[PDB]
Amino acid sequence: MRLFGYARVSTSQQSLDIQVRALKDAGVKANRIFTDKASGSSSDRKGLDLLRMKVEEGDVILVKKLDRLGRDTADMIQLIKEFDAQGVSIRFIDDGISTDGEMGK
């Protein structure tokens, strides 16, 4: 089990630093900070891209709320269904627990 934290910058000053402090404050290790330097030529979705292959069985993925996971398509729910099937959890600073309620009821 480990404390992985997903991050993504939105501003063009030092959002990666502010994000990391947000994941660490949430309970994430600096060594496990899969951030995303979106402040570039295009969106750098490499954090969850590598997180899907770096999380361990029974690991907790702490996500911060600075902008938004996805936008239109089920992106925020995509990596959530991928980790949910891998036996991994995803904590949310917005509440403290994971998506305890994401089905097509």
From Swiss-Prot:
Domain of life assignment: Bacteria
Keyword match Zinc-finger: no
GO molecular function annotations of the record: DNA binding; DNA strand exchange activity
Job of this protein: This protein catalyzes the site-specific recombination of the transposon and also regulates its frequency of transposition.
Resolvase/invertase-type recombinase catalytic domain sequence ranges: 2-105
Gene Ontology biological process terms in this record: DNA integration
Active site: S10 (o-(5'-phospho-dna)-serine intermediate)
Range covered out of full length: 1 to 105 of 183
UniProt-recorded name of the protein: Transposon gamma-delta resolvase
Keyword annotations: DNA integration, DNA recombination, DNA-binding, Plasmid, Transposable element
Gene name in the database record: tnpR
Keyword RNA-binding found: no
Organism: Escherichia coli (strain K12)
Family per record: Belongs to the site-specific recombinase resolvase family.
